[PDB]
Amino acid sequence: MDQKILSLAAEKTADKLQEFLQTLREGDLTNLLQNQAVKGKVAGALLRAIFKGSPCSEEAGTLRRRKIYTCCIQLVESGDLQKEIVSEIIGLLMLEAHHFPGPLLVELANEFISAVREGSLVNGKSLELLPIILTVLATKKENLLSGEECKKQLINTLCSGRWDQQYVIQLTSMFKDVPLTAEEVEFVVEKALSMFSKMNLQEIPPLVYQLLVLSSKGSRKSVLEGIIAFFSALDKQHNEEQSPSGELRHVEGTIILHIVFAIKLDYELGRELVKHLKVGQQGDSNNNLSPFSIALLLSVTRIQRFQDQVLDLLKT
Amino acid sequence: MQIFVKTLTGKTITLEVEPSDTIENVKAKIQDKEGIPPDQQRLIFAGKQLEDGRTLSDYNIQKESTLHLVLRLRGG
Amino acid sequence: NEAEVDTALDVLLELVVLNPSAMMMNAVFVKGILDYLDNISPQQIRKLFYVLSTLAFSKQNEASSHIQDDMHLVIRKQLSSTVFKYKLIGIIGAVTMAGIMAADEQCTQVTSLLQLVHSCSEQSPQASALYYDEFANLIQHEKLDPKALEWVGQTICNDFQDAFVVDSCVVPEGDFPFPVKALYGLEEYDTQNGIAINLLPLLFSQDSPLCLAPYFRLLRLCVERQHNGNLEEIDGLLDCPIFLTDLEPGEKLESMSAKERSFMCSLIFLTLNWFREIVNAFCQETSPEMKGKVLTRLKHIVELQIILEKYLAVTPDYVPPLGLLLHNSHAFFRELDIEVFSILHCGLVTKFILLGPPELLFL
């Protein structure tokens, strides 16, 4: 039941495609999942008929569009399907989010938010849509509350919502590509850093990578504060357990290596770091440093631009 | 023998290789099971950047010990 | 820092032009720059790609053409990205690369390169703009092998003269809330011309026109390089009025301030920049009637800027920043050329006591 829709999306637009949407009416799930079971190539071409024939100039096309979007969010999350088909469909959905009126994206976004609460997020490739829709929201500056307020409520839900400890890294990476304020990057980093406590260890460094490259456009002192508090406190936990190492110090080393390599790009991070661990008044050097921070600085040293200031700091 | 790698998306991945084997072999296996070519890969264990000509015996790397990866995009 | 960087790249260029074969063994160390390119200012990027490219495209170093395909590759990658900077960075490198290899398969290769950087840059307006601008700068400063130039100009002239150029048809396309008319003709020309500019329908369809002025700049420099300063194909272009709103009144339509005000304001802005490049163009021409028409255009300019500052005074913050009045003077407008001030050879005509004064103020 497929070739009577490529005979619609070839000749004319909105004369015969829109009529198909109202006339069929039986469903939009059984025809797509099972279409991929025989020939996946047809499925990628079927979606190219719906979105060309359902523009958001009219209500019915917009609601058909919303239903196909929710159903594709379901199947991409559900199906143990071929990887290239998943890459294709997420690319197709990514291409079409541009001419959408304001008050439709709230539903898809709240669906994604409910997904972070409960959803089986086996793939974070469903979460690739969340970046673009929040920018397509903010560019629509009319009463949906204006677009930015819906965005901020959404971010507050995303942070204040509870995070499936496995797939929080991908969630964290989604905030990377959206242009945010200092306040919203601050919200995500402070909560995401509060998440560090309630985890396995070994996932943390790439998390830190994503945190850092996001931190390049926001609050970075906040991240280093949280980092050093985390690792200094746990070092003391280890010291008192002594008076759990062979992995722990390893992960530390790797983290240090990540942040050195990221400073290698952005030097402002270096200067903000060193200002944090500026002794200045000597009492700061009785809350500033840990063994871990020191190890950081001595690793940092290797950058020829930083072999003076770091050493003057440690020495003095 | 089995080992772990973790990456910037948190894809925990399980690599079966003998310790006497070398690192570029693992880059071949990454190009195989994950489709990522060698030259973009940057492999780390415990805060050491791992080179090509070494092996897992050289770095005291053992069973189920977790490696870290990043995508060294020259340009990006 | 920045000054250290600049010094190093000056040094590098001096070495490679002097002692290239020495540098060729260190080619990998030169490529070892290529990670920290986000960290560095665009002008340094221009200089960087210059040095890599002149190292690559030397007639002796066609032995080691591995670096050649590598740098071709990375540029194709950098352009392939969606991001403003990566597309832009590639554009800049690609332009410089193209230009230096431009001094017959070489011609086909640079041709494919410009076609594909366009095809990649076709969609983003500021990126397409910067392409045009950098291409322009490259033709301006540098001289080379007119075969590529005669090739690409045949494309460019056709593209422009089909894109925005239309008939002097009093009826245009597009249902506006505005009385569209052919405004700012000289009127000493023949009013039945097949040359006029479909501007406001291109705008309302935009709601391609941002790139206009620089595309003309590029076109002009191309024509001058081809026919050696002969714009007889274009000399009947400044005879164009433009199919626009009744732009003149910015007081009768007061207190209905909507996106229509933004339309009008940025429209006038574009108009001004268009004229600005026109006067940059037809300054050198010794024809006295041409210069009279230039000064007609300057009278248009001053009244238009007056109208627009009035529009902004009445409607405060419907601001086009497009890459308060002090900001608008210098950067957001087109930098005029030096030889434009050939106009100063003319003598003033006072209006009261008895070439207007306020255009002289402007200059």
- State how many domains chain B has: 1
Task: Show which subunits contact A, needing at least 3 CB pairs below 8 angstroms.
Answer: B, C
Q: DSSP string of C194-246?
A: S-EE-HHHHHHHH---SSHHHHHHHHHHHHHHHHTS--TTTTTSTT--EEE--
**Token pair of A163 as six digits:** 């995070």
8 Å CB contact of C38 and A264: no
Residues in B closer than 8 angstroms to C89, CB to CB, are: 75
- For A163: left if phi > 0, alpha if psi spans -120 to 50, otherwise beta; the answer is beta
Neighbours of C159 (CB within 10 A): 13
How far, in Å, CA of C327 to CA of B46, rounded? 53
H/E stretch holding C360 reads: helix C357-362
Is residue B31 situated within a structural domain? yes
Q: DSSP string of B3-18?
A: EEEE-TT---EEEE--
Report yes or no: A227 and A277 within 8 Å, Cβ to Cβ: no
CA distance C5 to chain A (A): 13
Is residue B10 situated within a structural domain? yes
How far, in Å, CA of A3 to CA of A12, rounded? 15
Q: Which residues pair with B55 in a beta bridge?
A: B22
CA distances from C54 to A19, C50, C93, C122, C128 (A): 61, 6, 12, 28, 25
How far, in Å, CA of B15 to CA of B49, rounded? 18
Is residue B8 situated within a structural domain? yes
How far, in Å, CA of C119 to CA of C156, rounded? 14
Report yes or no: B26 and B14 within 8 Å, Cβ to Cβ: no
How far, in Å, CA of C184 to CA of C197, rounded? 11
How far, in Å, CA of A10 to CA of C164, rounded? 30
Among B75, B74, B76, B69, residue whose Cα is nearest residue B34: B69
* 3-class DSSP state of A125: helix
Q: Which residue on chain C is closest to A267 by alpha carbon?
A: C39
Question: How many Cα atoms occupy the beta-carbon half-sphere of A197 within 13 Å?
Answer: 7
Q: What is the largest CA-CA distance in chain B?
A: 35
Name the method of structure determination: cryo-EM
8 Å CB contact of C36 and A265: yes
Resolution of the experimental model, in Å, one decimal: 3.9
- C 52-91 residues with CB < 8 A to B: 74, 77-78, 81, 86, 89
Among C183, C189, C169, residue whose Cα is nearest residue C236: C189
Is residue B76 situated within a structural domain? no
Terminus-to-terminus CA distance in chain B, angstroms? 34
For residue C336, the 8-state DSSP code is: P
Q: List the CATH number of the domain containing B36.
A: 3.10.20.90
Identify the sign of the CA torsion A127, A132, A136, A138: positive
What amino acid occupies position C305? Q
CA distances from C114 to C50, C117, C138, C320 (A): 17, 5, 13, 30
- Say which of A169, A247, A299 has its CB closest to residue B10: A169
Terminus-to-terminus CA distance in chain C, angstroms? 37
Alpha-helix runs per DSSP H in chain A: 3-6, 17-24, 30-38, 40-53, 59-78, 83-95, 105-117, 129-138, 147-160, 168-177, 182-194, 204-215, 221-242, 248-263, 268-277, 291-300, 309-315
Is residue B67 situated within a structural domain? yes
Is residue B23 situated within a structural domain? yes
Domain containing residue B32? 2-71
How far, in Å, CA of C265 to CA of C247, rounded? 9
How far, in Å, CA of C164 to CA of C205, rounded? 13
Residues in B closer than 8 angstroms to C38, CB to CB, are: 76
8 Å CB contact of A254 and B47: yes
CA distance B5 to chain C (A): 24
CA distance B67 to chain C (A): 23
Q: Which residues pair with C174 in a beta bridge?
A: none
CA distance B20 to chain A (A): 22
Q: How many whole angstroms from its chain centre is CA A106?
A: 18
Q: Is A298 on the interface with C (CB under 8 A)?
A: no
Q: Is A264 on the interface with C (CB under 8 A)?
A: yes
CB pairs under 8 A between A and B: 51
- Residue B43 backbone dihedrals phi, psi, to 5 degrees: -105, 135
- Residue B67 backbone dihedrals phi, psi, to 5 degrees: -95, 165
**Token pair of A301 as six digits:** 């040293």
Residue entry with tokens 């002969």: C230
CB pairs under 8 A between A and C: 8
Among A61, A85, A60, residue whose Cα is nearest residue A75: A85
